[PDB]
Amino acid sequence: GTILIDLSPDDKEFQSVEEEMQSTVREHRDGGHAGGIFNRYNILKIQKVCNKKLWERYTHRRKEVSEENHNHANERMLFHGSPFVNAIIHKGFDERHAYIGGMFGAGIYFAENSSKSNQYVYGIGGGTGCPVHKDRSCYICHRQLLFCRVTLGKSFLQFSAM
Amino acid sequence: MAHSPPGHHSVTGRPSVNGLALAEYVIYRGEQAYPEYLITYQIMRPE
Numbered sequence: 196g197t198i199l200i201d202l203s204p205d206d207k208e209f210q211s212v213e214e215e216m217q218s219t220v221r222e223h224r225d226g227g228h229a230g231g232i233f234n235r236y237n238i239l240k241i242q243k244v245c246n247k248k249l250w251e252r253y254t255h256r257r258k259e260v261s262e263e264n265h266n267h268a269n270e271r272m273l274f275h276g277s278p279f280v281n282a283i284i285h286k287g288f289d290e291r292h293a294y295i296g297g298m299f300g301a302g303i304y305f306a307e308n309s310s311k312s313n314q315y316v317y318g319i320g321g322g323t324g325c326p327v328h329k330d331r332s333c334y335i336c337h338r339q340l341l342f343c344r345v346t347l348g349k350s351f352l353q354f355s356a357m
Numbered sequence: 358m359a360h361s362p363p364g365h366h367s368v369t370g371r372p373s374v375n376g377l378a379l380a381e382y383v384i385y386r387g388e389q390a391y392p393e394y395l396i397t398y399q400i401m402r403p404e
């Protein structure tokens with residue numbers, strides 16, 4: 196039930212999303228070990244993910260959360276990197292996409308820094324890198340991230356030493 | 358999956374040591390996120 200719509204690089208929506216990718220790169224304290232060494236991306240394609248069932252499942256929960264949080268869904272746009280991107284866009288997020296060993300418990304994790312999510316495209320801590328070259332810093336192979344609509348509602352603030 | 362703290366719908370992980378690191382967020386129900394955009398890209402070797 197999922198359709199993917201290519202956006203044109205001449206489209207304002209493409210440029211907007213690219214700018215969100217590019218402007219939220221940072222350096223990482225691992226020196227690039229997990230996600231590679233880079234300051235910017237080459238954006239190759241941006242697709243809108245269209246799935247009526249998954250969207251209505253999302254907006255149904257969004258309204259519940261809003262009503263429990265003084266009418267504020269606290270909706271953000273956040274990055275998610277995962278080896279399971281193809282399953283996520285067809286079936287949605289579920290517990291099998293959860294970070295079992297994540298610092299805040301077994302949940303689904305998102306980042307404001309695109310480069311944080313880039314650390315997980317090939318696995319936890321970058322895994323063994325790209326499947327072709329086994330290179331966590333591969334400049335050749337194409338990577339995929341998700342830029343996701345996320346309902347936070349009332350968010351528990353946890354000051355981590357990261 | 359685990360649960361969010363009672364009375365909450367998510368967790369905000371706010372880095373308190375790296376001033377340049379932005380926040381990370383956790384949800385505990387898949388229905389609270391929609392994968393809106395699929396972005397294909399390469400990282401670029403610094404000049």
Ligand SMILES: O=c1[nH]c(N2CCC3(CC2)CNc2cccc(Cl)c23)nc2c1CCCC2
Nearest residue numbers: 275276277293294304305306312315318319
């Ligand atoms: O975008 C993000 N994705 C993740 N994942 C957690 C690990 C996970 C892929 C997704 C989940 N289960 C599993 C099993 C096998 C391999 C892998 Cl890689 C994964 N964690 C984070 C961010 C950004 C914020 C910091 C944490």
Ligand SMILES: [Zn+2]
Nearest residue numbers: 325328333336
């Ligand atoms: Zn490669």
